[PDB]
């Protein structure tokens, strides 16, 4: 149809991000994909008078070997005017089960305003720089751009409506290039309905198993011992101490009493009836999340991750210090046993999706990894069309120690 | 010899305006020259005689080379008022990534900068003036029709044009690799030399088609090609000879150049040293200051001349073969590596300047060396090398498995080539039964910097020391130091030191503090140590 005029935020100029280095096999794929797009006219080569540039890369689509192009418009999105999309269906997070669909191909058939196109410039690198980069530029709505799903809102509600209305019980929420669907139906009943809608999306040209109901936020479980040692108490007291930044009614007072003096770190200490209760009060306090925590849209979402070693990782989603909106743990996936990076990135995505699911926005990550280490290998295990912001940090020792106490199931979710 | 090539739409920067700086005056001797030169270009089509309609202008000068008068137009201003382009290749190829070719012919497309047309709409900002004998009546007015030399857009635009043109040839001759660089095109192949030659000629002719005039036989470059300090031969590469001048008087500058060139050499030649020479720069008061070379220095500078007399050679990239990378810890913080496909035939070698930080360990540094290498390889060979590392897998597994930070090493293998990297020590998982227990503490007036530090053990031992000109961290750390000295091979130390907490997590083996270093030396010397952190007050 016609191109709706898009413009940057007042004063912002186009992105000029450098292209990170790409592997040979990755470059090969993008060259194919791109010459294809060129033919199909979605993109067309560009000159040097175009100074902008967004990084591109290639990922793997599930079940197939066929590569998928992925452009990182994080920078372009950021500088793009706002269209104030769809509000958040508070009911999504409630549904028993949710499924995600890749409908980024949809935009391919929609023209992009000609004046904006320049800002979509991207380059394909070349081994050892023996060939100048292959500069392209978009003509249609690009996948990964926030502007895309927006402009394609009418055209989407339209094609969705007859299903939403047909099935008013199921919830459909759209984010970036993805579609989040969640029903309470039985597994069989659910999946088929997805296929039903699928064929429906298929009717125009478009083709993860979540369960928000179980996303419980776990509690901190303090130790418990027959006899206690100076060390055991010394440790405990430090954690409770730190933790009182959250629950102020927490006390170490009495415990610190029976910790005065200078005795063997391994010597057993008798617990005074006062320490007993103090510790019991503390358990009662930690029995639940701190009161008064509510999500505030006007503020960014923050997600911190701590490496607990052995493949275990803890994370906290918050907007205010100690005022977490959600916390959790994450164990690596069968096949990441020697790759820290992989686990980290596998988790980032999971947490991001949940963020989306629950608030409809990706959180800002604080990754316990070195810039160079991450930037060099995450694209290798990335599998979402969207990309979350991030910063690299040094895990305060204690923060790790505290959440390391996160209550774990008796045996866990029993899959008979 | 101009061109039937499309021009690129060039605009100025955000609402600025074409330069308008007056024409530097010149002598009759310099004017005659420019008029000469200009009249030729005027006909060669490069520039066009204009008039007063042009409100813009730029300074033109006259400089002779080694004695004909050549001209120079100063575009600094325009260049400033010129939009931006996409960097015209700032990443050049590294010899370690070239494939060997049966042939490599280099075509010169020099004057080509003056061969491609300019944006007809832009040509006015290029206007310049040829003065008249000392500020007389106005001079001769011109403006560039082709890409002007020294202009901001020229490099970017030239390379783009040359790409469109080479599009076809390349699409039609897959078995041929061309490398665009400034005025050169290094074209290589694996076809039989006759075939090669024929194709080359085909290229030259295709170029001639777009007005890109054919070079000469005189100006033809031949192997070995000199590239970023290297000599590129058809079958191998070598290093451009590097000579250290012999002098009786060495100035600061001379010692810095020497150090400069020497450092770059540490990358290809094994054994290079500059420590003693580097002492020569202490308290230096002026670049020209004469510093007498110490015996250690003269010796060092000596061995070096000899090392540099070594014929280090290398090989080219063979896609069919593995990419191996072997690393050596040449010392704390210092590392060396060599990327090879087949034993002893290196593609690339390298070293990493003593990475000195605030606090890490060898394994961590090992990892960093590895990544810098991997990033390097990806750019050069579009793939990562299999790693041969001087560290057992148990050591790695032990470290990485529990380290607080995410880290990784791609596929790799062990190679027992001392010195190997290891964990100098490992804080115990649990307090030590039997071992003594120190309850250390350090206190200092942050302002009077007067402090004390000591400990008291569950066993009676106690000490205290007064320290002047000290900080709280030190005292505390000192508290820890003594505990480590005055203790046996198994100690349990408790502290309310926030730093000692970072040490418990990172368990460094090197840092910015001699003090922390001292603690480490003691930590290492111990048989069993359990650090414990407890809240202060
Ligand atoms: C005569 C050998 O020239 C080095 N060389 C070369 S020429 C080399 C010349 C210096 C700049 C980078 C390219 C090529 C190509 C690019 C022609 C090659 O594929 N392989 C090589 O070994």
Dihedral through CA B232, CA B238, CA B240, CA B246, nearest 10? -170
Count CA within 13 A, CB hemisphere, residue A371: 1
The count of domains in chain B is 5
Residue B120 tokens read as 């007809």
Reference B38, options B54, B27, B29, B49; nearest CA is B49
Minimum CA–CA partner of B430 in chain A: A231
Tell me the pairing of strands B140-142 and B128-130. antiparallel
Question: With contact defined as beta carbons under 8 Å apart, do A53 and B90 qualify?
Answer: no
| B374, B431, B501: residue with CB nearest A397 | B501
Question: Alpha-carbon distance B381 to B377, whole Å?
Answer: 5
Count CB-CB contacts under 10 A for residue B428. 17
Coil/strand/helix, residue B396: helix
Question: Alpha-carbon distance A324 to A317, whole Å?
Answer: 6
Sheet holding B176-181, edge to edge: B103-108, B184-189, B176-181
Residue indicated by tokens 């999340």? A289
| B157, B504, B532: residue with CB nearest A397 | B504
Tell me the pairing of strands B436-439 and B176-181. unpaired
Question: Alpha-carbon distance A369 to A394, whole Å?
Answer: 8
Q: How far is the CA of B523 from the centre of ligand 1 (A)?
A: 53
> Does one domain contain both B103 and B121?
no
> Does one domain contain both B3 and B149?
yes
* Cβ-Cβ contacts under 8 Å, A58 against chain B: none
Residue A313 tokens read as 């990782």
Residue B363 tokens read as 């394994």
- DSSP string across B331-394: ETTEEEEEEEEETTEEEEEEEE-----SEE-HHHHHHHHHHHHHHHHHHHHSSPPEEEESS-HH
Dihedral through CA B98, CA B100, CA B106, CA B109, nearest 10? -30
**Interchain pair B532, A127: CB under 8 A:** no
> Does one domain contain both B242 and B356?
no
Question: With contact defined as beta carbons under 8 Å apart, do A343 and A311 qualify?
Answer: yes
What is the dotted CATH code of the domain comprising A91-107+149-212? 3.30.70.270
| A24, A231, A263: residue with CB nearest B383 | A24
> Does one domain contain both B184 and B291?
no
Question: Alpha-carbon distance A111 to A138, whole Å?
Answer: 9
Count CB-CB contacts under 10 A for residue B353. 10
Q: How far is the CA of B238 from the centre of ligand 1 (A)?
A: 13
Mutate: best of A127, A379, A393, partner B, most B CBs <10 A: A127
**Interchain pair A21, B375: CB under 8 A:** yes
Question: With contact defined as beta carbons under 8 Å apart, do A209 and A357 qualify?
Answer: no
Pairs of residues, one from chain A and one from chain B, whose beta carbons lie less than 8 Å apart: 165
Residue A143 tokens read as 């996948």
First to last CA, chain A: 53
Question: Which residues have CB under 6 Å of ligand 1?
Answer: B 93, 98-101, 104, 177, 179, 186-188, 223, 225, 227, 232, 234, 316
**Interchain pair A262, B86: CB under 8 A:** no
Question: With contact defined as beta carbons under 8 Å apart, do B277 and B300 qualify?
Answer: yes
Q: How far is the CA of A407 from the centre of ligand 1 (A)?
A: 62
Which residues, in sequence order, are CB contacts of B390 under 8 Å at separation 6+?
B327, B328, B329, B414, B415, B416, B417, B418, B419, B420, B421
Coil/strand/helix, residue B464: strand
Question: Alpha-carbon distance A182 to A194, whole Å?
Answer: 9
State which of B262, B288, B317 marks the end of a domain. B317
Reference B323, options B97, B100, B92, B95; nearest CA is B97
Question: Alpha-carbon distance A308 to B403, whole Å?
Answer: 9
Whether A348 has its CB under 8 Å from any CB of chain B: the answer is no
Q: How far is the CA of B92 from the centre of ligand 1 (A)?
A: 12
User: How far is A17 from chain B, CA to nearest CA, in Å?
Assistant: 11
Output the known binding site of B for Mg(2+): 108, 183-184, 441, 476, 496
Question: Alpha-carbon distance B225 to B101, whole Å?
Answer: 13
Minimum CA–CA partner of A261 in chain B: B458
Which residues, in sequence order, are CB contacts of B395 under 8 Å at separation 6+?
B363, B420, B421, B422, B423
| Residues in chain A after which the backbone breaks (C–N beyond 2.5 Å) | 84, 207
* Residue A296 assigned to a binding site: no
Coil/strand/helix, residue B63: strand
User: How far is A404 from chain B, CA to nearest CA, in Å?
Assistant: 12
Question: With contact defined as beta carbons under 8 Å apart, do A348 and A367 qualify?
Answer: yes
* Residue A102 assigned to a binding site: yes
Q: Pick the residue whose CA is nearest to atom 7 on ligand 1.
A: B186
Task: Give the CA radius of gyration of chain B.
Answer: 33
Q: How far is the CA of B520 from the centre of ligand 1 (A)?
A: 50
Instruction: Tell me the backbone φ, ψ of residue B530, rounded to 5 degrees.
Output: -125, 105
**Interchain pair A310, B401: CB under 8 A:** yes
> Does one domain contain both B1 and B149?
yes
Tell me the pairing of strands B490-495 and B528-533. parallel
Domain encompassing residue B179:
89-113+155-223
Tell me B47's DSSP state: B
Mutate to test the pocket of ligand 1, among B97, B98, B185, B315 (most ligand atoms within 8 A of CB): B98
What is the dotted CATH code of the domain comprising A296-402? 3.30.70.270
Dihedral through CA A101, CA A104, CA A109, CA A110, nearest 10? 120
Tell me the pairing of strands A302-307 and A364-367. parallel
User: H or E element: which one contains A70?
Assistant: strand A67-71
Q: How many residues does chain B have?
A: 537
User: H or E element: which one contains B196?
Assistant: helix B193-209
CATH number of the domain within which B455 lies: 3.30.420.10
Whether A398 has its CB under 8 Å from any CB of chain B: the answer is yes
> Does one domain contain both B66 and B84?
yes
> Does one domain contain both B386 and B410?
yes
**Interchain pair A262, B533: CB under 8 A:** no
Whether B501 has its CB under 8 Å from any CB of chain A: the answer is yes
Question: Alpha-carbon distance B59 to A25, whole Å?
Answer: 50
Dihedral through CA B41, CA B47, CA B49, CA B55, nearest 10? -140
Confirm whether A91-107+149-212 and A296-402 share one CATH topology: yes
**Interchain pair B535, A237: CB under 8 A:** yes
Whether B237 has its CB under 8 Å from any CB of chain A: the answer is no
- Distances from the Cα of B94 to the Cα of A128, B161, B232, angstroms: 7, 24, 11
**Interchain pair A51, B84: CB under 8 A:** yes
State which of B223, B251, B266 marks the end of a domain. B223
* Domain definitions of chain A by residue range: 1-86+108-148, 91-107+149-212, 213-295, 296-402
* Cβ-Cβ contacts under 8 Å, B121 against chain A: none
Minimum CA–CA partner of A309 in chain B: B402
Question: With contact defined as beta carbons under 8 Å apart, do A315 and A328 qualify?
Answer: yes
State which of B424, B452, B475 marks the end of a domain. B424
- Residue A87 backbone zone (phi > 0: left; psi -120 to 50: alpha; other: beta): beta
Give the start-end residues of each E strand in B85-190: 103-108, 128-130, 140-142, 176-181, 184-189
Tell me A381's DSSP state: S
Helix, strand, coil share (%) of chain B residues, nearest 5: 30, 25, 45
Question: With contact defined as beta carbons under 8 Å apart, do A212 and A95 qualify?
Answer: yes
CATH topology of domain A1-86+108-148: HIV Type 1 Reverse Transcriptase; Chain A, domain 1 (3.10.10)
User: H or E element: which one contains A331?
Assistant: strand A323-331
CATH number of the domain within which B246 lies: 3.30.70.270
* Cβ-Cβ contacts under 8 Å, A369 against chain B: 405-407
Query: What burial letters (b/e) apply to B460-475, b meaning 16+ CB within 10 Å?
Result: eeebeeebeebebbbb
> Does one domain contain both B195 and B236?
no
Q: How many residues does chain A have?
A: 416
Question: With contact defined as beta carbons under 8 Å apart, do A185 and A197 qualify?
Answer: no
Give the class (CATH, top level) of A213-295.
Answer: alpha beta
Question: Alpha-carbon distance A23 to B377, whole Å?
Answer: 9
Give residues 177 to 236 of A whose Cβ lies within 8 Å of B. Answer: 229, 231, 234-235
Q: How far is the CA of B2 from the centre of ligand 1 (A)?
A: 29
Tell me the pairing of strands A364-367 and A390-392. parallel
Question: Alpha-carbon distance B247 to B234, whole Å?
Answer: 37
Residue B64 tokens read as 């002779």
């Amino acid at each position: 149809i016609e191109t709706v005029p898009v413009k940057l935020k007042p004063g912002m100029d186009g992105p000029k991000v450098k292209q990170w280095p790409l592997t040979e096999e990755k470059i090969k794929a993008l060259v194919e994909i791109c010459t294809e797009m060129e033919k199909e006219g979605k993109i067309s080569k560009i000159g040097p008078e175009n100074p902008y540039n967004t990084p591109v890369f290639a990922i793997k689509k599930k079940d197939s070997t066929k590569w998928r192009k992925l452009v990182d418009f994080r920078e372009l999105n950021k500088r793009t005017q706002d269209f104030w999309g769809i509000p958040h269906p508070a009911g999504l997070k409630k549904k028993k089960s949710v499924t995600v669909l890749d409908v980024g191909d949809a935009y391919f058939s929609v023209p992009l305003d000609e004046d904006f196109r320049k800002y979509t410039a991207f380059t394909i690198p070349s081994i050892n720089n023996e060939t100048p980069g292959i500069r392209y530029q978009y003509n249609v709505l690009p996948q990964g751009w926030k502007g895309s799903p927006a402009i394609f809102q009418s055209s989407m509600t339209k094609i969705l409506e007859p299903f939403r209305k047909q099935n008013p019980d199921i919830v459909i929420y759209q984010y970036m290039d993805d579609l989040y669907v969640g029903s309470d139906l039985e597994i069989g009943q659910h999946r088929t309905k997805i296929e039903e809608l699928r064929q429906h999306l298929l009717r125009w040209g478009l083709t993860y198993e979540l369960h928000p109901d179980k996303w419980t936020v776990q509690p901190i479980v303090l130790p418990e011992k027959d006899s206690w040692t100076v060390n055991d108490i010394q440790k405990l007291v430090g954690k409770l101490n730190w933790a009182s930044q959250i629950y102020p009614g927490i006390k170490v007072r009495q415990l610190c009493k029976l910790l005065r003096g200078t005795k063997a770190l391994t010597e057993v200490i008798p617990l005074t009836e006062e320490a007993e209760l103090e510790l019991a009060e503390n358990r009662e306090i930690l029995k639940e999340p701190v009161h008064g925590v509510y999500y505030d849209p006007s503020k960014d979402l923050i997600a911190e991750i701590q490496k607990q070693g052995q493949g275990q990782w803890t994370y906290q989603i918050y907007q205010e210090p100690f005022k977490n909106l959600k916390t959790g743990k994450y164990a690596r996936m069968r096949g990441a046993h020697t790759n820290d990076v992989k686990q980290l990135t596998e988790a980032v995505q999971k947490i991001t999706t949940e963020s989306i699911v629950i608030w409809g926005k990706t959180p800002k990550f604080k990754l316990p990894i070195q810039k160079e280490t991450w930037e060099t290998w995450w694209t290798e295990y990335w599998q979402a069309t969207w990309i979350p912001e991030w910063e690299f940090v040094n895990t305060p020792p204690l923060v790790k120690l505290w959440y390391q106490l996160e209550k774990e199931p008796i045996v866990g979710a029993e899959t008979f | 010899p101009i061109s039937p090539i499309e021009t690129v739409p060039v605009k100025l920067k955000p609402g600025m305006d074409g330069p308008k700086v007056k024409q530097w005056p010149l002598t009759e001797e310099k004017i005659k020259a420019l008029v000469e030169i200009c009249t030729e270009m005027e006909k060669e089509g490069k520039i066009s005689k204009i008039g007063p309609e042009n409100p813009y202008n730029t300074p033109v000068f006259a400089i002779k080379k080694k004695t004909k008068w050549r001209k120079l137009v100063d575009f600094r201003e325009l260049n400033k008022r010129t939009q931006d382009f996409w960097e015209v290749q700032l990443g050049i190829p590294h010899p370690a990534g070239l494939k060997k070719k049966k042939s490599v012919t280099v075509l010169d497309v020099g004057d080509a900068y003056f061969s491609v047309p300019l944006d007809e709409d832009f040509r006015k900002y290029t206007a310049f003036t040829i003065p008249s004998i000392n500020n007389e009546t106005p001079g001769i007015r011109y403006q560039y029709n082709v890409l002007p030399q020294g202009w901001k857009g020229s490099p970017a635009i030239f390379q783009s044009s040359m790409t469109k043109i080479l599009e076809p040839f390349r699409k039609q001759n897959p078995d041929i690799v061309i490398y665009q660089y400034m005025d050169d095109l290094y074209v290589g192949s694996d076809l039989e030399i006759g075939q090669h030659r024929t194709k080359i000629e085909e290229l030259r002719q295709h170029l001639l088609r777009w007005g890109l005039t054919t070079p000469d036989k005189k100006h033809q470059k031949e192997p070995p090609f000199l590239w970023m300090g290297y000599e590129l031969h058809p079958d191998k590469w070598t290093v451009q000879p590097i000579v250290l001048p012999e002098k009786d008087s060495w100035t600061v500058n001379d010692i810095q150049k020497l150090v400069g060139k020497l450092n770059w050499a540490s990358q290809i030649y094994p054994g290079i040293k500059v420590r003693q020479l580097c002492k020569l720069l202490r308290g230096t008061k002026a670049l020209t200051e004469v510093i007498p070379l110490t015996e250690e220095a003269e010796l060092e500078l000596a061995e070096n001349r000899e090392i540099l007399k070594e014929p280090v050679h290398g090989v080219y990239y063979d896609p069919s073969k593995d990419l191996i990378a072997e690393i050596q810890k040449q010392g704390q913080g210092q590392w060396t590596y060599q990327i090879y496909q087949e034993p002893f035939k290196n593609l690339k070698t390298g070293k990493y300047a003593r990475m000195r930080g605030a606090h890490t360990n060898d394994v961590k540094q090992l990892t960093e060396a590895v990544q810098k290498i991997t990033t390097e390889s990806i750019v050069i060979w579009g793939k990562t090398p299999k790693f041969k590392l001087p560290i057992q897998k148990e050591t790695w597994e032990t470290w990485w498995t529990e380290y607080w930070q995410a880290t990784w090493i791609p596929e790799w293998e062990f190679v027992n080539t001392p010195p190997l990297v290891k964990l100098w020590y490992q804080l115990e998982k649990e307090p030590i039964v039997g071992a003594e227990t120190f309850y250390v503490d350090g206190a200092a007036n942050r302002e009077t910097k007067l402090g004390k530090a000591g400990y008291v053990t569950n066993r009676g031992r106690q000490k205290v020391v007064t320290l002047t000109d000290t900080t709280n961290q030190k005292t505390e750390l000192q508290a820890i130091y003594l505990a480590l000295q005055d203790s046996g091979l198994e100690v349990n130390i408790v502290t309310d030191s926030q730093y000692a907490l970072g040490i418990i997590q990172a368990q460094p083996d090197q840092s910015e503090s001699e003090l922390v270093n001292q603690i480490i030396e003691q930590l290492i010397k111990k048989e069993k140590v359990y650090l414990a952190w407890v809240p202060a007050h």
